[PDB]
Amino acid sequence: SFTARPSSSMADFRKFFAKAKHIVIISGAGVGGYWRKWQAQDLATPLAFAHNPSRVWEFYHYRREVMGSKEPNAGHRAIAECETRLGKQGRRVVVITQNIDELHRKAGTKNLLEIHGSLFKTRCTSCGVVAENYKSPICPALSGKGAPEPGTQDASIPVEKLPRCEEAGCGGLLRPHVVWFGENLDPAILEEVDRELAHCDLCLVVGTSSVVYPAAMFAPQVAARGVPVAEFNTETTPATNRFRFHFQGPCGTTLPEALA
């Protein structure tokens, strides 16, 4: 149990990167946090939804509005373009994202695993159907709601006027198709994650990536197998010292360099 610190040698990393046949890129929020008086993690829970579906929908309406307008940043683009370029060489890049904003998709990434769902899908709490939804606003009663300042008045929308299911004989209440804290991730998605992690020969962990479980154990699983992991993050994390490399800085700076 040597005091193992990660390398910051970019040239050594790029040596691995030139040879790698299957690169797994794990990403997080760099793309709690607070909306009004609440920690984001405390809205993103089925108990918040069961007990105040209006407050949760006002929050996800906000998130949909804010994120729906965002363009991909230099990190997303570099990751997308690295996938295309390596693709033409018979080399695999896959992104496993903890994010729900779809910005990897907007940047053109094709091999993408969204492990916590999407702002832009709903699921019906009655019949269970999942559907895409980019409609702004998602229902009329949320029009102009969702403002983030502490002190902003609650909408208090009656449940009947919240987003509703359009399937025949249904009209049930919709929720965001987002995996919430205390909910299980999709078992089929976790088995696919396992297969990518077991076969990759290089893993990057970006934006980080290391405080939401089980996703937080993904890169360390890869390193515990002896495969190199490079972490790109503005600060160090509880997992850093498990990895082969650590590149500090905003990843709109480092990632483009590392992936070039």
Binding site: F181, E183, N184, V211, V212
Partner: peptide
Amino acid sequence: TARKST
């Protein structure tokens, strides 16, 4: 283990 948490 499959259960999302912080």
